[PDB]
Amino acid sequence: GPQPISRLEQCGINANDVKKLEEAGFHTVEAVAYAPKKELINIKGISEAKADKILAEAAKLVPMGFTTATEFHQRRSEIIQITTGSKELDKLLQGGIETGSITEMFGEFRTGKTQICHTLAVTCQLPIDRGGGEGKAMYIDTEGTFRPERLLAVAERYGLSGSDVLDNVAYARAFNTDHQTQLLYQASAMMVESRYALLIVDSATALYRTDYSGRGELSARQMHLARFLRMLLRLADEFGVAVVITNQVVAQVPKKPIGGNIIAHASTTRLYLRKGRGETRICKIYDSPCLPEAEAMFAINADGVGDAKD
Amino acid sequence: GPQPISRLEQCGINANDVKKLEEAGFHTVEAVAYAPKKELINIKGISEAKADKILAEAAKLVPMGFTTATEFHQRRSEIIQITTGSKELDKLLQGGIETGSITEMFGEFRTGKTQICHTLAVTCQLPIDRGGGEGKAMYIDTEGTFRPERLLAVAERYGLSGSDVLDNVAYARAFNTDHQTQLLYQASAMMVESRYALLIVDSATALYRTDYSGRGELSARQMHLARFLRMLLRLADEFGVAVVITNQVVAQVPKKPIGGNIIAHASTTRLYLRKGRGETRICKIYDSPCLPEAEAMFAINADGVGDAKD
Amino acid sequence: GPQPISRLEQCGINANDVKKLEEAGFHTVEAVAYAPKKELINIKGISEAKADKILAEAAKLVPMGFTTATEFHQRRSEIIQITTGSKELDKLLQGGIETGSITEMFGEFRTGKTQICHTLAVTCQLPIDRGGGEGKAMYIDTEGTFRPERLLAVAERYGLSGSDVLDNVAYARAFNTDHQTQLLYQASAMMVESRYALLIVDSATALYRTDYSGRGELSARQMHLARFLRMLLRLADEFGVAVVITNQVVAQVPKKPIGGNIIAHASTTRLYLRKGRGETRICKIYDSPCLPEAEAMFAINADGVGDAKD
Numbered sequence: 001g002p003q004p005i006s007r008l009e010q011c012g013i014n015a016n017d018v019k020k021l022e023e024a025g026f027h028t029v030e031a032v033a034y035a036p037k038k039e040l041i042n043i044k045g046i047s048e049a050k051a052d053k054i055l056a057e058a059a060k061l062v063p064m065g066f067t068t069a070t071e072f073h074q075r076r077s078e079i080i081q082i083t084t085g086s087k088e089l090d091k092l093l094q095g096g097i098e099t100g101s102i103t104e105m106f107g108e109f110r111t112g113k114t115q116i117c118h119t120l121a122v123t124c125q126l127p128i129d130r131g132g133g134e135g136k137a138m139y140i141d142t143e144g145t146f147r148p149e150r151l152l153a154v155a156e157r158y159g160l161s162g163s164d165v166l167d168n169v170a171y172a173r174a175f176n177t178d179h180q181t182q183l184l185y186q187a188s189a190m191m192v193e194s195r196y197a198l199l200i201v202d203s204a205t206a207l208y209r210t211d212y213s214g215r216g217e218l219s220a221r222q223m224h225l226a227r228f229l230r231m232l233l234r235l236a237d238e239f240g241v242a243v244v245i246t247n248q249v250v251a252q253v254p255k256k257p258i259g260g261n262i263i264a265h266a267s268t269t270r271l272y273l274r275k276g277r278g279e280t281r282i283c284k285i286y287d288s289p290c291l292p293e294a295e296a297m298f299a300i301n302a303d304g305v306g307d308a309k310d
Numbered sequence: 311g312p313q314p315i316s317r318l319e320q321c322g323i324n325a326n327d328v329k330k331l332e333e334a335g336f337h338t339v340e341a342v343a344y345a346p347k348k349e350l351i352n353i354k355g356i357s358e359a360k361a362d363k364i365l366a367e368a369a370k371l372v373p374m375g376f377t378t379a380t381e382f383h384q385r386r387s388e389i390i391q392i393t394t395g396s397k398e399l400d401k402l403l404q405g406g407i408e409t410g411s412i413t414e415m416f417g418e419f420r421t422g423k424t425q426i427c428h429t430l431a432v433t434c435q436l437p438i439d440r441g442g443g444e445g446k447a448m449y450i451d452t453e454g455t456f457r458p459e460r461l462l463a464v465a466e467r468y469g470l471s472g473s474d475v476l477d478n479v480a481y482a483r484a485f486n487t488d489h490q491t492q493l494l495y496q497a498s499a500m501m502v503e504s505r506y507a508l509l510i511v512d513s514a515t516a517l518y519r520t521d522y523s524g525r526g527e528l529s530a531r532q533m534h535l536a537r538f539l540r541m542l543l544r545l546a547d548e549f550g551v552a553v554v555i556t557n558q559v560v561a562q563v564p565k566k567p568i569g570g571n572i573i574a575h576a577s578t579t580r581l582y583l584r585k586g587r588g589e590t591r592i593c594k595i596y597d598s599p600c601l602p603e604a605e606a607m608f609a610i611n612a613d614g615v616g617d618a619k620d
Numbered sequence: 621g622p623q624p625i626s627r628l629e630q631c632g633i634n635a636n637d638v639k640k641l642e643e644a645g646f647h648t649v650e651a652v653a654y655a656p657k658k659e660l661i662n663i664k665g666i667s668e669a670k671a672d673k674i675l676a677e678a679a680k681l682v683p684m685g686f687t688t689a690t691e692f693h694q695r696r697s698e699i700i701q702i703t704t705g706s707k708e709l710d711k712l713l714q715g716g717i718e719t720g721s722i723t724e725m726f727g728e729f730r731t732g733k734t735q736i737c738h739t740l741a742v743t744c745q746l747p748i749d750r751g752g753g754e755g756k757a758m759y760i761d762t763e764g765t766f767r768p769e770r771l772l773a774v775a776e777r778y779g780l781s782g783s784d785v786l787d788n789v790a791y792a793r794a795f796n797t798d799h800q801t802q803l804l805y806q807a808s809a810m811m812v813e814s815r816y817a818l819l820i821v822d823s824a825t826a827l828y829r830t831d832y833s834g835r836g837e838l839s840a841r842q843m844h845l846a847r848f849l850r851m852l853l854r855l856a857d858e859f860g861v862a863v864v865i866t867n868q869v870v871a872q873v874p875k876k877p878i879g880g881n882i883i884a885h886a887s888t889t890r891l892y893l894r895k896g897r898g899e900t901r902i903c904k905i906y907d908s909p910c911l912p913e914a915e916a917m918f919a920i921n922a923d924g925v926g927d928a929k930d
């Protein structure tokens with residue numbers, strides 16, 4: 001996995017600058033490697049020569065050069081894909097949700113954008129042979145709609161200890177945009193000690209629609225949103241985890257996702273959800289760089305997300 | 311093609327200054343010919359007399375004088391044009407994408423700005439008689455949206471060995487502006503050994519919107535962007551390759567490309583992409599010094615970019 | 621026209637100093653007459669007495685005294701004006717572009733600042749009775765956007781041999797500021813043998829925005845720009861040709877031309893270009909010592925610049 005920043009000590013760097021970088025939010029050598037010189041210079045206790053020697057030492061451990069696409073293809077052959085509990089949903093995703101990208105699911109209310117996250121938070125702990133990811137699950141909430149009862153219900157479905165499921169899930173509720181951005185630093189800190197395999201944000205844009213209610217604040221809020229998305233992308237690239245976010249929909253004068261072009265460009269795989277009939281739902285791939293546009297049917301049962309049991 | 315800097319040895323120059331220039335990033339005699347005296351003086355181990363004698367010797371091999379436009383027209387008669395796989399798209403471009411300039415394609419998300427690059431990366435390896443370029447393809451990524459599966463799918467369309475396609479493509483993912491600029495030096499180094507025919511950057515402005523988020527950093531970031539564009543122009547002029555870049559779009563208070571006047575002036579051919587109906591797309595020439603404004607229709611099929619199969 | 625420097629031999633000057641002046645860039649007696657003593661002294665093989673006798677002999681052939689403004693008015697009655705192909709554009713310019721001054725056209729991208737030069741390069745070869753200038757055209761390029769196809773298209777419009785048009789046009793592409801200044805010496809050399817009637821630079825400031833990227837280099841680059849502008853002014857005064865340059869625009873925190881006060885003061889007639897609707901464009905006189913501020917409409921057709929065919 002990720003090399004702890006403790007190694008940077010034996011490269012010829014004193015232990016003082018190591019913790020000076022620690023307070024800045026960096027905890028791994030890869031995290032420091034990907035950061036340009038500007039943020040390192042921004043840190044109060046680092047000179048230009050210090051930043052240059054740090055970057056030079058860090059670049060040795062992490063390769064940053066050109067490679068043949070055959071090696072990249074072989075590396076992509078071992079991406080871990082998490083199953084969603086529904087065979088038709090998994091066939092649409094060609095196996096499941098990839099680890100190392102941003103996946104966004106949006107749609108009308110009552111379409112169960114939260115039950116997907118609830119089911120994933122538990123199916124991600126399954127062994128790899130069964131389609132899981134063998135790791136803890138991290139949940140960030142902004143609506144207060146987190147219910148452990150669904151977690152227990154879907155844990156009993158796969159035959160797992162209910163107590164051991166509620167012990168590998170970290171929960172924290174945000175209250176504003178600032179706290180939402182601040183929680184990512186603590187997430188990066190805790191991802192180094194243990195191993196995580198899924199990051200869930202619900203909802204990524206439920207706060208930005210209200211805090212910046214003024215007219216002239218649109219350009220002021222989309223910049224902050226871009227910073228948040230880049231932080232999530234850095235976390236995905238560093239620890240190699242899967243990030244899933246939920247987005248609201250705003251009707252247009254038939255439904256258009258809210259967030260502007262920033263979230264559309266940043267996101268790689270986007271799923272459109274609309275209600276079917278009864279408890280059935282319809283999932284359609286809205287945007288993806290490798291999958292074609294299609295539709296799938298799934299139902300919300302008492303044991304989490306399952307196939308359309310008619 | 312380009313004359314290796316090894317020849318500059320027999321002009322009356324010692325082998326020490328040759329590698330001193332090599333560390334600076336110069337690898338061909340043409341590259342040294344186009345560089346003014348200021349950068350040569352900037353190099354630590356070169357005196358003013360050394361720079362003057364180097365420029366005087368280099369100017370002999372590379373012509374730098376006035377010529378009749380008839381010779382230039384005859385030279386332009388042999389520009390290599392790469393086909394895009396769609397006949398209607400090729401008719402709009404009057405044959406294909408020229409080699410020796412900067413081509414920029416931009417538009418809303420999901421409009422397939424990346425599938426064009428994926429198709430070009432493979433069609434550029436076709437024999438010239440079939441519309442290819444007979445050369446390797448170089449891919450620089452900033453979004454992590456590189457998928458070899460599309461490359462294999464579009465390679466099987468033209469009847470080519472899938473393994474031999476993924477072996478003539480160099481892939482490298484950038485993480486910040488500094489790394490994006492630094493990768494060009496390695497690209498220039500590797501263009502001398504083998505032969506390349508296409509340079510792809512995706513995306514050229516996906517990083518600059520976030521790194522320089524401060525208000526007073528606009529003039530600080532557009533200068534760096536101008537340096538990057540001039541480096542790309544120098545690469546295009548030196549090795550005679552084709553450079554294609556992808557640009558995001560920002561809505562205006564109906565879509566305006568992001569990048570400012572610098573990218574607009576630097577770019578020669580600009581393509582505007584918007585979604586048609588279903589899997590069809592609409593391509594419109596936005597800016598070009600020789601082609602008139604028009605529209606074309608193409609569709610994204612399972613075998614890459616193809617004609618509108620209705 | 622201009623008296624060759626060969627005459628200076630029969631004034632009492634040996635043939636050695638004549639070619640010593642030739643290597644310095646002087647080729648006509650008028651060119652030597654306008655140069656102060658400082659540059660002549662700067663030449664290695666000339667003494668103070670030599671420079672004084674050269675200036676004294678040269679001043680006899682070229683008048684340098686006061687004259688009545690009636691003679692100047694009668695001389696101005698025979699200025700050659702080149703038509704731009706559009707009647708509304710010509711009415712704005714009161715006949716066309718004068719010969720013996722610097723004309724600058726600037727504006728947003730895609731406004732066709734290069735198509736004006738392409739059309740002029742061909743309309744300048746027309747007979748005087750038809751509004752031409754009866755002379756060759758000289759083109760200096762810095763963007764690589766020179767296309768002979770537009771030249772042929774606009775040559776067929778006026779009924780001229782396509783081959784004979786591409787044979788009276790000299791093309792040369794600059795790569796840095798130093799080469800841009802150096803090409804003027806060769807232009808001055810070749811203007812003596814044949815007859816030229818138009819000098820085109822595109823773009824005059826496309827290189828200076830990047831080469832001198834440092835903060836403290838602003839005063840270092842504007843001096844060089846002033847030298848370049850004075851060289852162009854000397855060429856215009858000596859051979860009596862028309863000089864046209866193209867300038868980029870930089871947005872201000874609605875568009876401001878780039879170049880500073882030097883280019884504004886040096887230029888005499890400045891044209892502001894902005895896009896109309898469709899293929900139409902709007903031309904506005906920005907600065908001129910004799911024409912009032914007004915607006916005109918023209919369109920970019922398939923046969924070069926023409927009137928607004930609605």
Ligand SMILES: Nc1ncnc2c1ncn2[C@@H]1O[C@H](COP(=O)(O)OP(=O)(O)OP(=O)(O)O)[C@@H](O)[C@H]1O
Pocket residue numbers: 108109110111112113114115116143145300301302
């Ligand atoms: N225990 C349960 N058993 C069966 N169906 C349930 C259960 N709990 C909730 N549901 C159903 O799931 C749906 C609610 O899902 P959810 O709250 O995730 O929707 P949502 O669209 O993501 O919500 P919002 O956007 O309002 O936060 C409703 O149709 C509800 O009837």
Ligand SMILES: Nc1ncnc2c1ncn2[C@@H]1O[C@H](COP(=O)(O)OP(=O)(O)OP(=O)(O)O)[C@@H](O)[C@H]1O
Pocket residue numbers: 264265266267268286287288289290291292293418419420421422423424425426453455610611612
């Ligand atoms: N294998 C495939 N077969 C058919 N269509 C596909 C396939 N893979 C992706 N698509 C379609 O191509 C489009 C996605 O293209 P692409 O990712 O290049 O878009 P983009 O606008 O360049 O993206 P962005 O700006 O978000 O990076 C979608 O319409 C998607 O349905």
Ligand SMILES: Nc1ncnc2c1ncn2[C@@H]1O[C@H](COP(=O)(O)OP(=O)(O)OP(=O)(O)O)[C@@H](O)[C@H]1O
Pocket residue numbers: 574575576577578596597598599600601602603728729730731732733734735736763765920921922
């Ligand atoms: N053959 C043609 N027929 C008709 N219109 C054309 C033709 N070639 C180019 N155009 C149009 O002319 C315009 C491009 O002109 P041009 O390249 O001179 O612009 P510019 O503003 O000077 O460019 P830049 O500053 O980017 O160098 C575009 O509107 C393009 O559609």
Ligand SMILES: [Ca+2]
Pocket residue numbers: 109110
């Ligand atoms: Ca609700």
Ligand SMILES: [Ca+2]
Pocket residue numbers: 113114143145202
């Ligand atoms: Ca919810």
Ligand SMILES: [Ca+2]
Pocket residue numbers: 264265266267268269287288419420
């Ligand atoms: Ca996307």
Ligand SMILES: [Ca+2]
Pocket residue numbers: 289423424453455512
């Ligand atoms: Ca993409």
Ligand SMILES: [Ca+2]
Pocket residue numbers: 574575576577578579597729730
């Ligand atoms: Ca352009």
Ligand SMILES: [Ca+2]
Pocket residue numbers: 599733734763765822
């Ligand atoms: Ca141009």
Ligand SMILES: [Ca+2]
Pocket residue numbers: 884885886887888889907908
């Ligand atoms: Ca003026």
